[PDB]
Each structure stands twice: as structure tokens, then as C-alpha cells.
Amino acid sequence: ALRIDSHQHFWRYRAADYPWIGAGMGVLARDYLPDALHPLMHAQALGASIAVQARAGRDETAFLLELACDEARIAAVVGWEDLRAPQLAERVAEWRGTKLRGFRHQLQDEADVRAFVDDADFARGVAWLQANDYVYDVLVFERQLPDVQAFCARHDAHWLVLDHAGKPALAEFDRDDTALARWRAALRELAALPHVVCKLSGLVTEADWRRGLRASDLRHIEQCLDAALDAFGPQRLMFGSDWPVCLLAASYDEVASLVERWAESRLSAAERSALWGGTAARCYALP
Numbered sequence: 345a346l347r348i349d350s351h352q353h354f355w356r357y358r359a360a361d362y363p364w365i366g367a368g369m370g371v372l373a374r375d376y377l378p379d380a381l382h383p384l385m386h387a388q389a390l391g392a393s394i395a396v397q398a399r400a401g402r403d404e405t406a407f408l409l410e411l412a413c414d415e416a417r418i419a420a421v422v423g424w425e426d427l428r429a430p431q432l433a434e435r436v437a438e439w440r441g442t443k444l445r446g447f448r449h450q451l452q453d454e455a456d457v458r459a460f461v462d463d464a465d466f467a468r469g470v471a472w473l474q475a476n477d478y479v480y481d482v483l484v485f486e487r488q489l490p491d492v493q494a495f496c497a498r499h500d501a502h503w504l505v506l507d508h509a510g511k512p513a514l515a516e517f518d519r520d521d522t523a524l525a526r527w528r529a530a531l532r533e534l535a536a537l538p539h540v541v542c543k544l545s546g547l548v549t550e551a552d553w554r555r556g557l558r559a560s561d562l563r564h565i566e567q568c569l570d571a572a573l574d575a576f577g578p579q580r581l582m583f584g585s586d587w588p589v590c591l592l593a594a595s596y597d598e599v600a601s602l603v604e605r606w607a608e609s610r611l612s613a614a615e616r617s618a619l620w621g622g623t624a625a626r627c628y629a630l631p
């Protein structure tokens with residue numbers, strides 16, 4: 345049974361190439377390469393990871409597949425391509441036979457997410473992806489969930505992965521007694537689509553990490569894990585670390601531990617096996 349970290353990044357850091365790494369994020373402002381990741385995975389008995397594009401450009405795809413090309417502990421890559429580009433197929437051919445299993449665009453940084461996903465060219469690209477058994481990772485903020493609802497429903501030919509459980513606004517759970525409710529309604533609406541699955545990752549960094557993770561953040565996170573379980577069911581949940589991004593808020597070990605303690609509480613042995621690699625294996629077509 346594969347044990348998979350379904351969501352991590354790599355980079356040789358250069359400030360202008362990673363606009364999302366800004367002020368107060370100095371911990372991220374350095375290289376993060378497979379060698380730093382292996383001991384972390386080893387400590388959690390995770391045998392392989394999935395490398396996910398951390399910036400927009402084909403060279404990011406090339407870079408990740410280069411790291412992946414001949415490294416057993418990287419099982420798959422989620423790349424980046426211009427999905428609106430008419431030459432999509434030709435471009436993806438360069439990656440034939442490799443561990444490329446899917447694509448992601450950083451939708452959360454789009455100004456009109458809805459206009460972006462409902463675009464005729466982008467839709468063509470995604471439909472082509474699905475026709476070729478490519479996964480598409482959905483990365484949006486909680487408030488953008490309704491903007492991608494219709495998009496997810498129309499692209500039902502292959503698996504869509506909701507990154508970071510759709511980023512609940514955990515920092516607001518105590519100020520805004522509608523934050524949890526709003527996210528849950530949106531989550532449930534997506535989960536009702538059979539071809540959509542859910543990553544349990546990226547939650548420590550939706551809390552107020554700048555001021556520091558508190559015990560109450562861990563409880564809200566558990567609330568989100570429970571909501572995700574209820575909406576998606578135990579067979580559509582996928583552990584990911586979101587390393588190295590998670591280092592803003594918590595260690596790799598802490599990230600894995602809180603999901604583990606939660607899973608031992610709520611899931612059977614078999615369901616845990618799905619959470620810790622089985623679901624990622626089947627959705628990303630892993631050996």
C-alpha cells in the first residue's frame with residue numbers, strides 16, 4: 345500500500361519568480377530540493393511524494409520532471425502549461441512517458457476567477473486534459489468556491505482535485521461565525537460531484553501563522569477535517585503536506601501528526617490506508 349505525500353513543492357529560490365512569497369515569509373526564501381524532503385518523508389513512513397507546480401511556466405514543468413525523471417521517491421508531477429494555447433497537445437508531448445500526471449493553474453490569483461474558468465479556450469484545454477487522463481488541481485480561496493462550481497460540474501471526464509480543502513478561512517472562525525458555515529456549504533456543493541476529490545493539506549497556513557499557531561487553531565482544523573470527511577467520504581480524502589509552504593506555520597512532522605491523530609480517531613484502518621496514499625494512487629494513476 346503506497347504511502348504518498350500528495351502535495352509538495354520544490355524550488356531553487358529567486359525572489360521575482362515566486363511573487364506569492366512576500367513579506368514575513370523569509371523561511372521560504374531559500375532552496376527547497378528533494379534532499380531536504382526525503383528525511384521528512386522517511387520519518388513519516390511516506391514512500392513517495394507528488395511535486396506540484398509552484399509558479400506559472402513550462403520551465404517549472406521541465407524543472408519538476410527533471411527532479412522526478414529518475415527519482416523513485418517522486419511518484420508524479422502536477423505541471424503547468426498554458427491551457428488556453430492552441431498548441432497545448434504538441435507542448436504536452438515533450439512530457440510523454442514521464443511522471444507528469446496532471447496540471448494546475450493558480451486560479452486563486454486571478455481577478456475574475458469565474459471569467460477565467462468559463463473562458464472558451466481554457467475550457468478547451470481542460471477538456472483536452474481530461475480526454476487524455478490528466479488530473480486538474482483546483483486551487484482557490486474559499487470565497488472563490490462558487491466561482492468554480494459550474495466549471496467543476498462541466499469538466500466531469502476525469503478527476504478534479506480540490507487543493508487544501510478549498511482553503512477555509514480558519515483565521516476568521518472566531519470573528520466570523522459564518523466563515524465555517526459558508527465554506528461548508530460551498531464544500532458540500534462541490535463534493536456532490538463524484539469526479540471531485542479533496543486534499544487535506546495546507547490547513548496550518550490558513551490560520552494566523554504570523555502570530556503563531558495556537559491550540560484553538562488545531563481544533564478549527566479538526567472541524568474542517570470532519571466537514572471534509574462528511575462531505576467527501578473517506579475514499580476521496582488525500583493527505584498532502586504542502587511542504588515547504590507549511591513551514592510558515594508548522595513542521596512537516598506537526599503537519600502529518602495532526603492529520604494522523606485525527607485519522608486514528610475518525611477512520612478505520614482501511615480508510616486510513618486510502619487517506620495516506622490509496623486515494624492519491626488511484627486518482628493520479630500511480631504504480
Ligand SMILES: [Zn+2]
Pocket residue numbers: 413414
Ligand atoms: Zn529519466
